[PDB]
Amino acid sequence: EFLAKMTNGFSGADLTEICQRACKLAIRESIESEIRRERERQTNPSAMEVEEDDPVPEIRRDHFEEAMRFARRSVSDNDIRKYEMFAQTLQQSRGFGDFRFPS
Amino acid sequence: FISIKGPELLTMWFGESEANVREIFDKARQAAPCVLFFDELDSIAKARVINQILTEMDGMSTKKNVFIIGATNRPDIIDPAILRPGRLDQLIYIPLPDEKSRVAILKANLRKSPVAKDVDLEFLAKMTNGFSGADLTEICQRACKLAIRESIESEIRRERERQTNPSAMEVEEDDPVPEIRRDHFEEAMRFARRSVSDNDIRKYEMFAQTLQQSRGFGDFRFPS
């Protein structure tokens, strides 16, 4: 809900991108975390993690906090006024307005 | 209430008397609670004095309660420097007259003329639909002209009676048209014409949409 009312003028195809940028930003760290775990110097059987450590099991908070920095609204204000102007080109129930039948 | 008009305005800069608005402003300073009213201040935008009002409005203090209401008909052609906050901020849109306003103005123009009591006006109100306020003020002069024609013509035959004898003479004034009857409006309505079209009221609606008109996010609430 806090991510909802912060993105204000964003189109529906723009905030569907940041929930892929955050997934890419977490897959980068989950690939990179497995590099050091196999590249342990003197990788000895002593004190070995027989259990999977799972450093990134799910998308955390700072992935969205970092993926939000590259957000950009695609539609401007100058072109939404074009569709509002076409909506005004439809006469839009304007003219006389209310009248009543006689009694 | 003072009032300067279009032709009184642009005749300053057509003859290069640009520094001649200081007197019409300090005359407004002398009468403290006034509302000086420009009229058609876009009249010089056919081809200055907007700058001469512009350097004067900021120099005018606020403890005096003089207000500057300006009217126009082409709101896009106006100088945008007049719309900076501090100088002239509010943009009130005056629409075409609706029904109750129409019956009000129609009764208002017939204060002087005696009208017959069976002349309806609510039926004349909701029949004229897209008429501007300056068009239905014309038919309550066309009907007066159409009744004055018949009241002049009726006096011609009364003095041009053949063998105008003193026998059976109307010593009383007959008064054939004492007031505006019904068929004068029924005949004067035939020449009615709306002045403003539909294509140009959409221009003012479009300028009203050029003002962003409270659009964007909309409702939000403070947290609890």
Side-chain angles (χ1 to χ4, degrees):
Chain A
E1 289 91 3
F2 191 77
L3 196 39
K5 53 197 176 76
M6 209 48 63
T7 80
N8 205 1
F10 274 6
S11 78
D14 294 19
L15 83 164
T16 194
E17 182 262 359
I18 78 168
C19 47
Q20 286 181 13
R21 175 81 44 87
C23 300
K24 194 187 293 178
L25 199 68
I27 196 49
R28 174 193 304 174
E29 194 180 2
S30 163
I31 286 296
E32 190 265 350
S33 196
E34 296 301 311
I35 285 303
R36 54 99 179 169
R37 258 175 46 195
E38 67 98 16
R39 219 194 50 191
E40 294 161 347
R41 296 296 98 194
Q42 47 99 31
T43 311
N44 46 1
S46 53
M48 213 55 246
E49 312 284 330
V50 296
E51 50 93 24
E52 198 70 17
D53 315 327
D54 293 308
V56 189
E58 81 284 341
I59 290 184
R60 295 165 307 138
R61 180 191 297 260
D62 49 353
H63 300 104
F64 278 104
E65 191 177 359
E66 184 46 54
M68 203 57 206
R69 213 160 64 193
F70 313 137
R72 43 183 297 266
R73 43 191 84 196
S74 136
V75 54
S76 87
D77 186 272
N78 197 270
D79 44 356
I80 195 177
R81 212 155 45 186
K82 188 67 63 65
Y83 304 138
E84 202 74 35
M85 192 284 271
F86 183 73
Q88 289 318 297
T89 313
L90 193 148
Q91 291 206 17
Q92 209 170 353
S93 297
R94 290 179 176 161
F96 48 93
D98 288 340
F99 90 111
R100 286 183 177 173
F101 269 44
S103 313
Chain B
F1 175 83
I2 82 168
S3 157
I4 83 166
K5 329 168 187 180
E8 214 273 339
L9 177 68
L10 83 159
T11 191
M12 292 151 182
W13 84 283
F14 212 76
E16 289 300 85
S17 182
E18 316 203 19
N20 209 38
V21 307
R22 313 183 87 259
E23 85 274 4
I24 73 174
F25 263 111
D26 76 335
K27 187 206 305 304
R29 291 183 183 174
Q30 290 178 335
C34 61
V35 279
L36 66 96
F37 170 77
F38 298 142
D39 199 350
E40 317 289 276
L41 64 97
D42 62 74
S43 160
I44 77 157
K46 69 178 301 166
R48 52 180 85 90
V49 200
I50 279 298
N51 193 272
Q52 205 56 50
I53 313 178
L54 211 50
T55 175
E56 210 274 343
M57 203 170 313
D58 295 352
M60 173 205 59
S61 158
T62 40
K63 300 308 168 186
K64 280 136 188 179
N65 44 7
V66 49
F67 308 112
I68 306 182
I69 42 180
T72 177
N73 302 326
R74 293 198 283 275
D76 55 353
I77 211 168
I78 212 173
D79 189 324
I82 212 74
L83 311 164
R84 187 149 285 106
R87 298 176 171 96
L88 273 178
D89 45 6
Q90 271 70 78
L91 268 299
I92 311 298
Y93 168 75
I94 292 305
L96 277 196
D98 57 51
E99 189 260 4
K100 292 179 179 179
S101 84
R102 269 200 302 281
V103 63
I105 186 170
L106 204 52
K107 291 180 179 179
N109 285 170
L110 298 194
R111 284 195 192 93
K112 315 297 181 191
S113 313
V115 64
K117 189 48 62 195
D118 66 325
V119 177
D120 198 3
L121 288 177
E122 289 91 3
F123 191 77
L124 196 39
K126 53 197 176 76
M127 209 48 63
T128 80
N129 205 1
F131 274 6
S132 78
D135 294 19
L136 83 164
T137 194
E138 182 262 359
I139 78 168
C140 47
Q141 286 181 13
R142 175 81 44 88
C144 300
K145 194 187 293 178
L146 199 68
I148 196 49
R149 174 193 304 174
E150 194 180 2
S151 163
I152 286 296
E153 190 265 350
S154 196
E155 296 301 311
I156 285 303
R157 54 99 179 169
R158 258 175 46 195
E159 67 98 17
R160 219 194 50 191
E161 294 161 347
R162 296 296 98 194
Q163 47 99 31
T164 311
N165 46 0
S167 53
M169 213 55 246
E170 312 284 330
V171 296
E172 50 93 24
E173 198 70 17
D174 315 327
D175 292 308
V177 189
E179 81 284 341
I180 290 184
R181 295 165 307 138
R182 180 191 297 260
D183 49 353
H184 300 103
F185 278 104
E186 191 177 359
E187 184 46 54
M189 203 57 206
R190 213 161 64 193
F191 313 137
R193 43 183 297 266
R194 43 191 84 196
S195 136
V196 54
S197 87
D198 186 272
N199 197 270
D200 45 356
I201 195 177
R202 212 155 45 186
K203 188 67 63 65
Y204 304 138
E205 202 74 35
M206 192 283 271
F207 183 73
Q209 289 318 297
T210 313
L211 193 148
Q212 291 206 17
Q213 209 170 353
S214 297
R215 290 179 176 161
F217 48 93
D219 288 340
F220 90 111
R221 286 183 177 173
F222 269 44
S224 313

Short mmCIF file of all heavy atoms in Angstrom, two decimals, chain A residues 33-70:
data_model
loop_
_atom_site.label_atom_id
_atom_site.label_comp_id
_atom_site.label_asym_id
_atom_site.label_seq_id
_atom_site.Cartn_x
_atom_site.Cartn_y
_atom_site.Cartn_z
N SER A 33 26.02 -14.94 -4.73
CA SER A 33 26.28 -15.53 -3.42
C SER A 33 26.74 -16.98 -3.53
O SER A 33 27.46 -17.46 -2.66
CB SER A 33 25.03 -15.44 -2.55
OG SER A 33 25.37 -15.67 -1.19
N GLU A 34 26.35 -17.67 -4.60
CA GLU A 34 26.82 -19.03 -4.79
C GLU A 34 28.24 -19.10 -5.32
O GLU A 34 28.83 -20.19 -5.31
CB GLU A 34 25.89 -19.78 -5.74
CG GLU A 34 24.50 -19.94 -5.19
CD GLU A 34 24.48 -20.69 -3.87
OE1 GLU A 34 25.13 -21.75 -3.79
OE2 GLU A 34 23.84 -20.21 -2.92
N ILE A 35 28.80 -17.99 -5.78
CA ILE A 35 30.16 -18.01 -6.30
C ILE A 35 31.16 -18.14 -5.15
O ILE A 35 32.05 -18.99 -5.19
CB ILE A 35 30.43 -16.76 -7.15
CG1 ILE A 35 29.73 -16.89 -8.50
CG2 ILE A 35 31.91 -16.53 -7.34
CD1 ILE A 35 30.15 -18.11 -9.28
N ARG A 36 30.99 -17.33 -4.10
CA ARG A 36 31.93 -17.37 -2.98
C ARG A 36 31.80 -18.66 -2.19
O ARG A 36 32.78 -19.10 -1.56
CB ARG A 36 31.71 -16.16 -2.08
CG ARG A 36 30.28 -15.97 -1.59
CD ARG A 36 30.07 -16.50 -0.18
NE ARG A 36 28.70 -16.30 0.28
CZ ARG A 36 28.19 -16.86 1.37
NH1 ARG A 36 28.93 -17.66 2.12
NH2 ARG A 36 26.93 -16.62 1.71
N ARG A 37 30.62 -19.28 -2.19
CA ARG A 37 30.41 -20.48 -1.39
C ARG A 37 31.12 -21.69 -1.99
O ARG A 37 31.51 -22.60 -1.26
CB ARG A 37 28.92 -20.74 -1.24
CG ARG A 37 28.39 -20.31 0.11
CD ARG A 37 26.89 -20.47 0.19
NE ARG A 37 26.45 -21.76 -0.34
CZ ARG A 37 25.19 -22.04 -0.66
NH1 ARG A 37 24.25 -21.12 -0.50
NH2 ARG A 37 24.88 -23.23 -1.13
N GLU A 38 31.27 -21.72 -3.31
CA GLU A 38 32.10 -22.76 -3.92
C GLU A 38 33.56 -22.34 -4.03
O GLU A 38 34.43 -23.21 -4.14
CB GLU A 38 31.55 -23.14 -5.30
CG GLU A 38 31.66 -22.05 -6.36
CD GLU A 38 32.87 -22.22 -7.25
OE1 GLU A 38 33.45 -23.33 -7.26
OE2 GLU A 38 33.26 -21.25 -7.93
N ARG A 39 33.84 -21.04 -4.01
CA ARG A 39 35.20 -20.52 -4.06
C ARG A 39 35.74 -20.20 -2.68
O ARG A 39 36.48 -19.23 -2.51
CB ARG A 39 35.26 -19.27 -4.94
CG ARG A 39 36.50 -19.17 -5.80
CD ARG A 39 36.60 -17.77 -6.35
NE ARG A 39 36.44 -16.79 -5.27
CZ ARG A 39 36.27 -15.49 -5.46
NH1 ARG A 39 36.24 -15.00 -6.69
NH2 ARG A 39 36.14 -14.68 -4.42
N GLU A 40 35.36 -20.98 -1.68
CA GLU A 40 35.95 -20.85 -0.36
C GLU A 40 37.40 -21.28 -0.42
O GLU A 40 37.72 -22.35 -0.95
CB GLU A 40 35.19 -21.70 0.65
CG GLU A 40 33.76 -21.26 0.90
CD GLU A 40 32.93 -22.36 1.51
OE1 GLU A 40 33.39 -23.52 1.51
OE2 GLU A 40 31.81 -22.07 1.99
N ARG A 41 38.29 -20.43 0.08
CA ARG A 41 39.69 -20.82 0.16
C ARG A 41 39.85 -21.86 1.26
O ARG A 41 39.19 -21.77 2.30
CB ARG A 41 40.58 -19.60 0.42
CG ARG A 41 40.55 -18.58 -0.72
CD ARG A 41 41.11 -19.16 -2.02
NE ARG A 41 40.07 -19.63 -2.93
CZ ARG A 41 40.30 -20.41 -3.98
NH1 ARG A 41 41.53 -20.81 -4.26
NH2 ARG A 41 39.29 -20.79 -4.75
N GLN A 42 40.76 -22.81 1.02
CA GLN A 42 40.90 -24.09 1.73
C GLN A 42 39.54 -24.71 2.06
O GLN A 42 39.16 -24.88 3.21
CB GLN A 42 41.82 -24.00 2.97
CG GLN A 42 41.65 -22.87 3.99
CD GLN A 42 40.86 -23.28 5.21
OE1 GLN A 42 40.89 -24.44 5.63
NE2 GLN A 42 40.12 -22.33 5.79
N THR A 43 38.80 -25.03 0.99
CA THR A 43 37.49 -25.64 1.16
C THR A 43 37.67 -27.06 1.67
O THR A 43 37.83 -28.00 0.88
CB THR A 43 36.69 -25.64 -0.15
OG1 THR A 43 36.72 -24.34 -0.73
CG2 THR A 43 35.24 -26.02 0.12
N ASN A 44 37.68 -27.20 2.93
CA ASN A 44 37.88 -28.33 3.81
C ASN A 44 36.54 -28.95 4.21
O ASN A 44 35.51 -28.26 4.23
CB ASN A 44 38.64 -27.90 5.06
CG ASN A 44 38.11 -26.62 5.67
OD1 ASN A 44 37.15 -26.03 5.16
ND2 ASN A 44 38.73 -26.17 6.75
N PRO A 45 36.51 -30.25 4.53
CA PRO A 45 35.27 -30.84 5.06
C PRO A 45 34.96 -30.42 6.48
O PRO A 45 33.84 -30.67 6.94
CB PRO A 45 35.54 -32.35 4.98
CG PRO A 45 37.03 -32.47 4.97
CD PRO A 45 37.53 -31.27 4.24
N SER A 46 35.89 -29.78 7.18
CA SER A 46 35.62 -29.30 8.52
C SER A 46 34.74 -28.06 8.48
O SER A 46 34.96 -27.16 7.65
CB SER A 46 36.93 -28.99 9.25
OG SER A 46 37.74 -28.11 8.48
N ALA A 47 33.75 -28.02 9.37
CA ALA A 47 32.76 -26.94 9.51
C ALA A 47 32.03 -26.68 8.19
O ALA A 47 31.76 -25.53 7.83
CB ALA A 47 33.40 -25.66 10.05
N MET A 48 31.70 -27.75 7.48
CA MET A 48 31.01 -27.62 6.20
C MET A 48 29.51 -27.46 6.41
O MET A 48 28.91 -28.12 7.26
CB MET A 48 31.29 -28.84 5.32
CG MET A 48 31.33 -28.52 3.83
SD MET A 48 32.50 -27.21 3.41
CE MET A 48 31.39 -25.93 2.83
N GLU A 49 28.91 -26.58 5.63
CA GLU A 49 27.47 -26.36 5.66
C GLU A 49 26.80 -27.48 4.87
O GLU A 49 26.68 -27.42 3.65
CB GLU A 49 27.12 -24.99 5.09
CG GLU A 49 27.95 -23.85 5.64
CD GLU A 49 27.52 -23.46 7.04
OE1 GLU A 49 26.33 -23.63 7.37
OE2 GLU A 49 28.38 -23.00 7.82
N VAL A 50 26.39 -28.52 5.59
CA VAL A 50 25.65 -29.61 4.94
C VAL A 50 24.25 -29.15 4.56
O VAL A 50 23.68 -29.62 3.57
CB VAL A 50 25.65 -30.87 5.83
CG1 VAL A 50 27.07 -31.38 6.00
CG2 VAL A 50 25.04 -30.58 7.20
N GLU A 51 23.67 -28.23 5.33
CA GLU A 51 22.40 -27.62 4.98
C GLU A 51 22.61 -26.48 3.98
O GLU A 51 23.64 -25.81 3.99
CB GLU A 51 21.70 -27.09 6.24
CG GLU A 51 22.59 -26.22 7.12
CD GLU A 51 22.46 -24.74 6.81
OE1 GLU A 51 21.41 -24.33 6.27
OE2 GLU A 51 23.41 -23.98 7.11
N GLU A 52 21.62 -26.29 3.12
CA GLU A 52 21.67 -25.16 2.20
C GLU A 52 21.40 -23.87 2.97
O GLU A 52 20.37 -23.75 3.65
CB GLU A 52 20.65 -25.33 1.08
CG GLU A 52 20.90 -24.47 -0.16
CD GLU A 52 22.11 -24.90 -0.97
OE1 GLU A 52 22.60 -26.04 -0.80
OE2 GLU A 52 22.56 -24.10 -1.81
N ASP A 53 22.32 -22.92 2.85
CA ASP A 53 22.26 -21.71 3.67
C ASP A 53 21.11 -20.80 3.25
O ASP A 53 20.48 -20.17 4.11
CB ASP A 53 23.59 -20.97 3.60
CG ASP A 53 24.78 -21.91 3.74
OD1 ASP A 53 24.65 -22.91 4.47
OD2 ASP A 53 25.83 -21.64 3.13
N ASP A 54 20.82 -20.76 1.94
CA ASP A 54 19.76 -19.98 1.30
C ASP A 54 19.84 -18.51 1.68
O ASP A 54 19.05 -18.04 2.51
CB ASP A 54 18.38 -20.54 1.66
CG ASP A 54 18.15 -21.91 1.08
OD1 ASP A 54 18.34 -22.06 -0.15
OD2 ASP A 54 17.79 -22.83 1.84
N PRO A 55 20.81 -17.77 1.14
CA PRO A 55 20.95 -16.36 1.55
C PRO A 55 19.82 -15.49 1.05
O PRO A 55 19.36 -14.61 1.78
CB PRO A 55 22.30 -15.95 0.94
CG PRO A 55 22.93 -17.24 0.45
CD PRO A 55 21.81 -18.14 0.13
N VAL A 56 19.36 -15.71 -0.18
CA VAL A 56 18.20 -14.99 -0.69
C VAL A 56 17.10 -16.01 -0.97
O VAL A 56 17.02 -16.54 -2.09
CB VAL A 56 18.54 -14.19 -1.95
CG1 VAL A 56 17.38 -13.29 -2.33
CG2 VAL A 56 19.80 -13.37 -1.74
N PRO A 57 16.26 -16.35 0.01
CA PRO A 57 15.15 -17.26 -0.28
C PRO A 57 13.97 -16.56 -0.92
O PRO A 57 13.17 -17.22 -1.59
CB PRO A 57 14.77 -17.82 1.10
CG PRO A 57 15.79 -17.27 2.06
CD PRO A 57 16.34 -16.04 1.44
N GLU A 58 13.85 -15.25 -0.74
CA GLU A 58 12.74 -14.49 -1.29
C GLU A 58 13.19 -13.05 -1.47
O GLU A 58 14.24 -12.64 -0.97
CB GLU A 58 11.51 -14.58 -0.39
CG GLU A 58 11.54 -13.63 0.79
CD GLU A 58 12.46 -14.09 1.89
OE1 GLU A 58 12.79 -15.29 1.92
OE2 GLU A 58 12.85 -13.26 2.73
N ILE A 59 12.37 -12.28 -2.18
CA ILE A 59 12.67 -10.88 -2.43
C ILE A 59 12.52 -10.10 -1.13
O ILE A 59 11.45 -10.08 -0.52
CB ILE A 59 11.76 -10.32 -3.53
CG1 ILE A 59 12.14 -10.93 -4.87
CG2 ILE A 59 11.87 -8.81 -3.58
CD1 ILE A 59 11.37 -10.37 -6.02
N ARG A 60 13.60 -9.45 -0.70
CA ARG A 60 13.58 -8.67 0.53
C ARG A 60 13.14 -7.23 0.23
O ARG A 60 12.65 -6.92 -0.85
CB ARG A 60 14.94 -8.73 1.21
CG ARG A 60 15.31 -10.12 1.70
CD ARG A 60 16.78 -10.21 2.02
NE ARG A 60 17.61 -9.76 0.90
CZ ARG A 60 18.69 -9.01 1.03
NH1 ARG A 60 19.08 -8.61 2.24
NH2 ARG A 60 19.38 -8.65 -0.03
N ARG A 61 13.34 -6.35 1.20
CA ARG A 61 12.81 -4.99 1.13
C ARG A 61 13.71 -4.08 0.31
O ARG A 61 13.24 -3.26 -0.49
CB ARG A 61 12.64 -4.45 2.54
CG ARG A 61 12.09 -3.06 2.66
CD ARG A 61 12.25 -2.59 4.09
NE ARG A 61 11.47 -3.41 5.01
CZ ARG A 61 10.29 -3.06 5.52
NH1 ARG A 61 9.75 -1.90 5.20
NH2 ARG A 61 9.67 -3.87 6.35
N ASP A 62 15.02 -4.22 0.50
CA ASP A 62 15.94 -3.30 -0.14
C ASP A 62 16.08 -3.56 -1.63
O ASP A 62 16.58 -2.69 -2.34
CB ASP A 62 17.31 -3.38 0.54
CG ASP A 62 17.79 -4.79 0.71
OD1 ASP A 62 17.01 -5.72 0.42
OD2 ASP A 62 18.95 -4.98 1.14
N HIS A 63 15.59 -4.70 -2.13
CA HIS A 63 15.54 -4.89 -3.57
C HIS A 63 14.54 -3.94 -4.20
O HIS A 63 14.82 -3.34 -5.24
CB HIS A 63 15.20 -6.33 -3.91
CG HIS A 63 16.17 -7.32 -3.40
ND1 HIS A 63 15.92 -8.11 -2.29
CD2 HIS A 63 17.41 -7.67 -3.83
CE1 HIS A 63 16.96 -8.89 -2.07
NE2 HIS A 63 17.87 -8.65 -2.99
N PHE A 64 13.38 -3.75 -3.56
CA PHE A 64 12.44 -2.77 -4.07
C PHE A 64 12.93 -1.37 -3.82
O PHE A 64 12.75 -0.48 -4.66
CB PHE A 64 11.08 -2.95 -3.42
CG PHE A 64 10.26 -4.02 -4.05
CD1 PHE A 64 10.11 -5.24 -3.43
CD2 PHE A 64 9.64 -3.80 -5.26
CE1 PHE A 64 9.35 -6.22 -4.01
CE2 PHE A 64 8.88 -4.78 -5.84
CZ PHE A 64 8.74 -5.99 -5.22
N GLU A 65 13.64 -1.18 -2.70
CA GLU A 65 14.18 0.13 -2.37
C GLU A 65 15.28 0.56 -3.32
O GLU A 65 15.50 1.76 -3.51
CB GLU A 65 14.69 0.08 -0.93
CG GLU A 65 15.05 1.38 -0.29
CD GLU A 65 15.47 1.17 1.15
OE1 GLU A 65 15.45 0.01 1.61
OE2 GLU A 65 15.84 2.15 1.82
N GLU A 66 15.96 -0.39 -3.96
CA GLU A 66 16.96 -0.08 -4.96
C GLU A 66 16.41 -0.11 -6.38
O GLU A 66 16.84 0.69 -7.22
CB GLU A 66 18.13 -1.06 -4.83
CG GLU A 66 19.30 -0.81 -5.75
CD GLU A 66 19.71 0.64 -5.80
OE1 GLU A 66 19.97 1.24 -4.73
OE2 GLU A 66 19.76 1.18 -6.92
N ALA A 67 15.43 -0.97 -6.66
CA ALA A 67 14.83 -1.01 -7.98
C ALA A 67 13.93 0.17 -8.25
O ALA A 67 13.68 0.48 -9.42
CB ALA A 67 14.03 -2.30 -8.15
N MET A 68 13.45 0.85 -7.21
CA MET A 68 12.60 2.00 -7.43
C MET A 68 13.38 3.18 -8.00
O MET A 68 12.77 4.07 -8.60
CB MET A 68 11.92 2.40 -6.14
CG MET A 68 10.65 3.18 -6.35
SD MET A 68 9.52 2.23 -7.35
CE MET A 68 8.55 3.52 -8.09
N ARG A 69 14.70 3.20 -7.83
CA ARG A 69 15.50 4.35 -8.25
C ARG A 69 15.56 4.52 -9.75
O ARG A 69 15.89 5.61 -10.22
CB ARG A 69 16.94 4.20 -7.77
CG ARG A 69 17.59 5.50 -7.43
CD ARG A 69 18.78 5.29 -6.55
NE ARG A 69 19.83 4.54 -7.21
CZ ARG A 69 20.86 4.02 -6.57
NH1 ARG A 69 20.97 4.16 -5.25
NH2 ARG A 69 21.79 3.35 -7.24
N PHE A 70 15.22 3.49 -10.52
CA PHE A 70 15.28 3.58 -11.96
C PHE A 70 13.90 3.74 -12.58
O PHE A 70 13.75 3.54 -13.79
CB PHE A 70 15.99 2.37 -12.55
CG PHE A 70 17.29 2.00 -11.87
CD1 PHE A 70 17.58 0.68 -11.59
CD2 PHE A 70 18.23 2.97 -11.52
CE1 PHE A 70 18.77 0.33 -10.97
CE2 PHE A 70 19.41 2.63 -10.91
CZ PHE A 70 19.68 1.31 -10.63
#
